[PDB]
């Protein structure tokens, strides 16, 4: 029933605030503070959509994306980063990201982008 979203960011403050916003909107949410943790969850649990930070402690969020997209091509993936670059944006595009947002992002904009991608997912089947 409920749409399920994974948030991956080593900033636990961002995890907390983002989870609260998403849960209040009515989503079921899981959080992860490292790329390895995110990947383990993606392997074992279903998600409609994931939000990925890029500058993660244990590996670049772009590597996380690449693996996640191989595992779950149908899942939507939005990069959300305060470390945007030409290199990591081009990589994110090639690796399967569906959207790319630069921090700080406000709650309304984040929810609107998520809804848009979840709608597109439904129309795709």
Residue whose CB is nearest to Na ion in the complex, by number: 55
Percent helix / strand / coil, the chain, rounded to 5: 50, 20, 30
User: Considering the rule CB under 8 A, would residue 20 count as an interface residue with its own copies?
Assistant: no
Please identify, using beta-carbon distances, which residue of 17 and 85 lies nearer to its own copies: 85
Taking residue 106's Cβ as centre, other Cβ atoms within 10 Å add up to 9
User: Considering the rule CB under 8 A, would residue 44 count as an interface residue with its own copies?
Assistant: no
Taking residue 103's Cβ as centre, other Cβ atoms within 10 Å add up to 13
Cα-Cα-Cα-Cα dihedral sign, residues 35, 61, 5, 12: positive
Residue 40 Cβ, how far from its own copies at the closest point, in Å?
26
Contact set with its own copies (CB under 8 A): 73, 84-86, 89-90, 92-94, 97, 99-100, 102, 113, 120, 123-125
């Amino acid at each position: 029933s409920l749409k399920r979203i994974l948030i991956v960011d080593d900033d636990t403050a961002i995890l907390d605030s983002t989870k609260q916003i998403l849960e209040f909107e009515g989503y079921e949410v899981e959080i992860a503070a490292t790329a390895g943790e995110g990947l383990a969850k993606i392997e074992n649990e279903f998600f409609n959509l994931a939000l990925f930070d890029i500058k993660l402690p244990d590996m670049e969020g772009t590597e996380l994306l690449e693996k996640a997209h191989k595992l779950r091509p149908g899942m939507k993936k939005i990069m959300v980063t305060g470390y945007a670059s030409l290199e990591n944006s081009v990589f994110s595009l090639n690796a399967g990201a569906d959207a790319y947002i630069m921090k700080p992002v406000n709650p309304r904009d984040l929810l609107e982008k998520i809804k848009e991608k979840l709608d597109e997912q439904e129309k795709e089947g």
